[PDB]
């Protein structure tokens, strides 16, 4: 299904792996997808997060507090966690329901909040961004693009 991801959405997933690698992590979790969506910095997901006051530094701080780093950075392919798999599966359905034939950054963010339970969701809530508020902000921004 990655063939259906936009260029930017693929860049988010590629960057998520390196977010994990550079924190000496050995799985790509939902929190690395969240870091990737912000750090990529251009798409509707990054805009939605920025527009709710969710910054890369806030997320980094919470990841260090909740997860912490390993001792060495791994080489080679880092596997998705079960919850990160579910986020990427759910992104497909968020896109179709919103009338998109491609999976964009915003659909990955919507998948993340649909899954709603993993480390990324915990971080968002701790930083004051309730799941429904995030979804509604994505809808508000997408509505502006219909002008």
């Amino acid at each position: 299904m990655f063939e259906r991801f936009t260029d930017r959405a693929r860049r988010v997933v590629v960057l998520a792996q390196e977010e994990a690698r550079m924190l000496n992590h050995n799985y790509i979790g939902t929190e690395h997808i969240l870091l990737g969506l912000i750090h990529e910095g251009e798409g509707v997901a990054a805009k939605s997060l920025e527009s709710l006051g969710i910054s890369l530094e806030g997320v980094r701080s919470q990841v260090e507090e909740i997860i912490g780093q390993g001792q060495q950075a791994p080489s080679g392919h880092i596997p998705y966690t079960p919850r990160a798999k579910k986020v990427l599966e759910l992104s497909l359905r968020e896109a179709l329901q919103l009338g998109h034939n491609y999976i964009g950054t915003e659909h990955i963010l919507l998948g993340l909040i649909r899954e709603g339970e993993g480390v990324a969701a915990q971080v968002l809530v701790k930083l004051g961004a309730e799941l429904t508020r995030v979804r509604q902000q994505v809808i508000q921004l997408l509505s502006g693009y219909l002008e």
Binding site: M1, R10, V14, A16, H77, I78, P79, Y80, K85, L88
Partner: peptide
């Protein structure tokens, strides 16, 4: 799809 980047 769905285990690693980008399978």
């Amino acid at each position: 799809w769905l285990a690693f980047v980008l399978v």
